[PDB]
Write a protein that binds this ligand. Structure first.
Ligand SMILES: *[C@H](O)[C@H](C[C@@H]1CCNC1=O)NC(=O)[C@@H]1CC2(CCCCC2)CN1C(=O)OCc1ccccc1
Ligand SMILES: *[C@H](O)[C@H](C[C@@H]1CCNC1=O)NC(=O)[C@@H]1CC2(CCCCC2)CN1C(=O)OCc1ccccc1
Lengths: 303, 303
């Protein structure tokens, strides 16, 4: 037992990380087969930057790619949306099985924070409803990726591009398409209002019950409509029948009907926690999906 | 910016993980050069188990070691305290530079949770003052290790052995010596009373200030003695002058004297948080060391 914010093992991704330098700008690239993927704002020059203009003015040799202490020769470049694709003369021998997938708000992933092509740390993140992520990123971390692992296959979902004024983070999928209404220029962009991921809170309440926290349970129940009236009032997003269905296995393992857990969440929203904690938190946690809870409270590995 | 519970990249450790089977018992082993390290309670037989007796009754071939889908031939075995050392005929070609270090309560490390020799997840843990760790471990996770990384060198500090009745976890250093007053038998052992790691709370308050949370600051100050009178009352462990010294760099970066931050912690203990949060937590967090804060709020990598 126990319940922790758990990231996927990062080794498969560590072997893909490289350093991309243009002029005085250095960030991280993702090296899969003979292509290095990186944010297009690495494109250097001596807001209003036209990246097509900037790139046509560039040569292959303007991009220095370092894989550890080995320099990768760039033989081609192209732009795909907000990412650069640097064709290199060497296929990465550590390329894992992978996919480029775009995730939904509410979904979680692991981030391998990197600087100068060197992995620094790994942590778990959720895509917020407003398409930001509450990450930990400093100068030079751009090009770090987010991912999930499913047996032996790495599903890359996120590449880091920028920080917004509230200290949250914005980026693209691996085809270069931004999550949310953000652009890779310097403007007055701001996150926009967020909501709490209701189905995830319920999943985490089920994790708590699995782990012996039961004090928040009650004998009351509620209808889905009646619950969603309360969710709206506390800035929780609506719960759908599909969310209820997704919570079925957790309901069945604990013997607590989904709508009964909703009754508990309702009382937690209306009353607070009265000095108590759930799974070591004094807040309702919304960054664990039902899959995350099942994975951890049952123990799936990856190879 | 941002602040997250960050683990070290796990790739160097993933390449050391193997599966050790004796009879019907399967757990994880750590394969470094030509030795596999694993908890001695894997020693199988068909509480009061005398492990010396059990081991002398065993043969090399009684231990099945699987490195992925490759079987490792055991050529020797020995007991060192509470760990088994299985000598195998093949040196692990992925052996990183490493050390076996024993950590202090208050210190943090990353855990690579493993099942059947296959890594499942990675998360950050602290050694509690009572020598337990609040982990996430299911059946089969024994032999998973905790570690820190310092440039290219892996400092192994923890190997997992058991769960205590409160759902917390106990284990050994890599020389087989238990952390805390626990034994690898089935008895009525229990964790024993814990305290909050004061110096770490202060480090995390400094992380908050670095990240823009300032509402808990105040103009008051306190003496070290006066602060420690309040710490005792709230089950915080005493703050020493060396803790104050260790917090110096964080003090200097923020311009907030250590004893001034103590005044803030004092008011937080006496008043609670009044519906506010710090770094996304409604509790005072004590599982980040001053080193962890500096590492994350400055960005050290590892290669
Ligand atoms: C890439 O390494 C870097 C990552 C930032 C630094 C601080 N936290 C992060 O996540 N990304 C940037 O600096 C991007 C690049 C930018 C200029 C070029 C076009 C796109 C946008 C500016 N930018 C950015 O994040 O600006 C906000 C910011 C916040 C704090 C510190 C520095 C910059
Ligand atoms: C090793 O994989 C396993 C890890 C446990 C299972 C549940 N959570 C964990 O961290 N360790 C054990 O099962 C140890 C072995 C034990 C018997 C042999 C001598 C030493 C102690 C019993 N034990 C244990 O953890 O018992 C408590 C427990 C708690 C919950 C479920 C099962 C067992």
């Amino acid at each position: 037992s126990g319940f922790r914010k758990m990231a996927f093992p990062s080794g498969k991704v560590e072997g893909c990380m490289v350093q991309v330098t243009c002029g005085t700008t250095t960030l991280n690239g993702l090296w899969l087969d003979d292509v290095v993927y990186c944010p297009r704002h690495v494109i250097c020059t001596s807001l209003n930057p036209n990246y097509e203009d900037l790139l046509i003015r560039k040569s292959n040799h303007n991009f220095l790619v370092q894989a550890g202490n080995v320099q990768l020769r760039v033989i081609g470049h192209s732009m795909q949306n907000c990412v650069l694709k640097l064709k290199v003369d060497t296929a990465n021998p550590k390329t894992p099985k992978y996919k480029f997938v775009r995730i939904q708000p509410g979904q979680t992933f692991s981030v391998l924070a990197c600087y100068n092509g060197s992995p620094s740390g790994v942590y778990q993140c959720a895509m917020r409803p407003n398409f930001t992520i509450k990450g930990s990123f400093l100068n030079g971390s751009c090009g770090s990726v987010g991912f999930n692992i499913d047996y032996d296959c790495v599903s890359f979902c996120y590449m880091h591009h920028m920080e917004l004024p509230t200290g949250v983070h914005a980026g693209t999928d691996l085809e270069g398409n931004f999550y949310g209404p953000f652009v890779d220029r310097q403007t007055a962009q701001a996150a926009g209002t967020d909501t709490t991921i209701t189905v995830n809170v319920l999943a985490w309440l089920y994790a708590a019950v699995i782990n012996g926290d039961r004090w928040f349970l009650n004998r009351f129940t509620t209808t889905l409509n009646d619950f969603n009236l309360v969710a709206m009032k506390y800035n929780y997003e609506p719960l759908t029948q599909d969310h209820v269905d997704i919570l079925g296995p957790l309901s069945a393992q604990t013997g607590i009907a989904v709508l009964d857990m909703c009754a508990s969440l309702k009382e937690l929203l209306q009353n607070g926690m009265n000095g108590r904690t759930i799974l070591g938190s004094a807040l309702l946690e919304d960054e664990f999906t039902p899959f995350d809870v099942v994975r951890q409270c049952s123990g799936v590995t990856f190879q």
